[PDB]
Design brief:
This is part of a larger assembly, with chains A (about 140 residues), B (about 110 residues), C (about 60 residues) and D (about 110 residues). Chain A is mainly β. Chain A is built from 1 helix and 10 strands. Chain A is globular and about 55 Å long. Chain B is of the alpha+beta class and about 110 residues long. The radius of gyration of chain B is 15 Å and the shape is globular. In chain B, a hairpin with a 6-residue loop joins β2 and β3. In chain B, about 15% of the residues are buried. Chain B has a single domain, classed as Ribosomal protein L17 (50s Ribosomal Protein L17, Chain: A), CATH 3.90.1030.10. A 5-stranded antiparallel beta sheet of chain D has the order 4-3-2-1-5, with no helix packed on it. In chain D, β3 and β4 form a beta hairpin. Classes of the chains: A mainly beta (about 140), B alpha+beta (about 110), C mainly beta (about 60), D mainly beta (about 110). Chains A and D meet through β1 and β2 of A and α1 of D. β4 of chain C pairs antiparallel with β4 of chain D. The structure holds 3 RNA strands. It is classed as ribosome.
RNA sequence: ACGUUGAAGACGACGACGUUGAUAGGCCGGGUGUGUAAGCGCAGCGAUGCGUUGAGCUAACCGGUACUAAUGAACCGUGAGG
RNA sequence: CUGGAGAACUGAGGGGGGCUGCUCCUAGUACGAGAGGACCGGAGUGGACGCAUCACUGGUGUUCGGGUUGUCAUGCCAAUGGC
RNA sequence: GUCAGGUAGAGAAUACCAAGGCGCUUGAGAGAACUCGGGUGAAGGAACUAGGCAAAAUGGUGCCGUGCACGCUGAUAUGUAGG
């Protein structure tokens, strides 16, 4: 996701929680790594959009192979042998609904305040590294 | 960490801005020309609309009656339809004295 | 300053109790004895004890 | 625009209009174990910070012996109502010099 | 590379954008700060205050707009891989 | 199993790390002839060190704005600017 | 050693001007890894040190307190004691 400023939310009881507000477009998978080829399980995902004239076709061909629209940058995360993903699958922010602690890259064990899909938005209690408009990686807290 | 003294810097731009208006073109170092823009166009924008207060404020800057007369009379109407970008910078090699990058800075006019 | 009426008017803090290298309790002074200094984002900008118990956790102080 | 859209619904439009140097009464919720009580605070506004959802104002109260300053968050749920008693006729944005007033009749 | 940017903390090959083009320097609108400007008018024919007017002004920032300028030729790196 | 580029991964090895104290439930429990009264695990509340670090709480901000003393220039008073 | 104007001021200090004398014999852009020197910056104002040293604070006089007055006075008086 992309960091978009910071604000606070007031609760009904009265306390105010300072929240880092992160915008997370739909993340669309581009490549799936497996034991047979890469020796490990991971999925490569992209986000955003890039100008056609500026995206070099070595990546465009790589994107076109998966039917994926050219995004900005590429990231991939290792799997936990408990989930499966297919090339071209679109991943939205609702996956964070069931998890209360998240890791933002690293500042770890941050409470999640609110998640919505209609506006592709995620909320984190605290501060995260980087200025506004920077790229952030949000994953569930490992220290359970 | 950035993410002449103030008085000298302010006076120099005030003088150079007046000379630019008077002559419509001047030869100066490229860094000076770039920084001069942030002082020059704001004067022309104010001159686009004429008022007693604007005339007084325009005088408080450049502290010269000739320039104020030059403004609000033809620089105003000549740039009324233009939304910014009243200045043009042309690089003209380097100064022989100290190899400084020199450039002409001139208002978009003189199309006779 | 002393909020109570124990007689003392001005006191000096000589040690901040509650932890190593530190309404918290403090040690103040020629008589040395403990004392106590008296969420929405608001801020509030502007008592002696017996070294064993409060006896001016602070029910009496709030009541008075 | 993401930030602004997020705070518009959180802000409250029932904010009364007051100016620095005005005598203001503000009601604030209080929690004592399991009860909600309304506490009334009387004072004079000496500073207002306008930032939208983060707008706040400082009120100085001359208590029994010494003054007490209190910074309220205008849009916080803790504050319920704000009422103006006197229209102070001052000509300064921040009245910090009262640490060490006329009436506007307008 | 050159030019418009450099909040990565000056050894700088680094984030993006360089005319199907808003990164920066301007012209507008909104918010904040400053808290009653210049000019005009009534009374006192002075020093203040009120109307004019919660207004005038506001840099590095927010929301828009390319009628200005980053344009069009080189140099470097090759042509089927023991 | 040495052609010329632009990305995403597997991480051996190495470096910075194994905070502290108190209360409550467990429990008028274990040990002991009584009183006094647990330890550990779990949860909660402070302080110190380090990374991130500004929507909200302070300070600072030689450019903009408000107010002003002595003197001077812009042929003048008023209205400004510079020191 | 002498001659050294106007305003402000107790003065021969200091600041601001006229006349006169000058820009001091390398410059144009970019910002600080804090080598040096000032103003300002929360305060339990001594948590530093042999010594609160050097800074800062401070200084005055439309004065009755062992705190008050201070930049301007429609008017008293369109200049009051008086040389």
């Amino acid at each position: 996701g992309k960091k978009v400023g910071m604000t606070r939310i007031f609760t009904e009881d009265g306390v105010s929680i300072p929240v880092t507000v992160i915008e997370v477009e739909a993340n669309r998978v581009t490549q799936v790594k497996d034991l047979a080829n890469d020796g490990y399980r991971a999925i490569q995902v992209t986000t955003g959009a890039k100008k056609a004239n500026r995206v070099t076709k070595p990546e465009a061909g790589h994107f076109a192979k998966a039917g994926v629209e050219a995004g900005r940058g590429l990231w991939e995360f290792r799997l936990a042998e408990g989930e499966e993903f297919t090339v071209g699958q679109s991943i939205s922010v609702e996956l964070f609904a069931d998890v209360k602690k998240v890791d933002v890259t690293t500042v770890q064990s941050l409470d999640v305040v609110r998640v919505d899909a209609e506006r592709n938005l995620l909320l984190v209690k605290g501060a995260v590294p980087g200025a506004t408009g920077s790229d952030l990686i949000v994953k569930p807290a490992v220290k359970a | 960490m950035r993410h002449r003294n103030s008085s000298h810097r302010q006076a120099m731009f005030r003088n150079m801005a007046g000379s630019l208006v008077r002559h419509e073109i001047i030869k100066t170092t490229l860094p000076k020309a770039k920084e001069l823009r942030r002082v020059v166009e704001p004067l022309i924008t104010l001159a686009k609309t004429d008022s007693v207060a604007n005339r007084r404020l325009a005088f408080a800057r450049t502290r010269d009656n000739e320039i104020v007369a030059k403004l609000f009379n033809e620089l105003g109407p000549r740039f009324a339809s233009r939304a910014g970008g009243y200045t043009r910078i042309l690089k003209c090699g380097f100064r022989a004295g100290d190899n400084a990058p020199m450039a002409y800075i001139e208002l978009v006019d003189r199309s006779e | 300053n002393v909020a109570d009426n124990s007689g003392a008017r001005r006191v000096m803090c000589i040690k901040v109790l509650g932890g190593s290298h530190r309404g918290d309790i403090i040690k103040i002074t020629g008589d040395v004895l403990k004392a106590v200094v008296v969420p929405d984002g608001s801020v509030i900008r502007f008592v002696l004890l017996n070294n064993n118990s409060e006896q001016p956790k602070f029910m009496k102080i709030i009541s008075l | 625009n993401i930030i602004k859209q997020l705070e518009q619904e959180q802000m409250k439009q029932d904010v009364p209009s007051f100016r620095p140097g005005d005598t203001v009464e503000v009601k604030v919720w209080v929690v004592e174990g399991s009860k909600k009580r309304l506490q009334a605070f009387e004072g004079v506004v000496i500073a207002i910070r306008n930032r939208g959802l983060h707008s706040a104002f400082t009120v100085r109260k001359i208590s029994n012996g010494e003054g007490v300053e209190r910074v309220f968050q205008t849009h916080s749920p803790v504050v319920d109502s704000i009422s103006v008693k006197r229209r102070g006729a001052v000509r300064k944005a921040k009245l910090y010099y009262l640490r060490e007033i006329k009436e506007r009749l307008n």
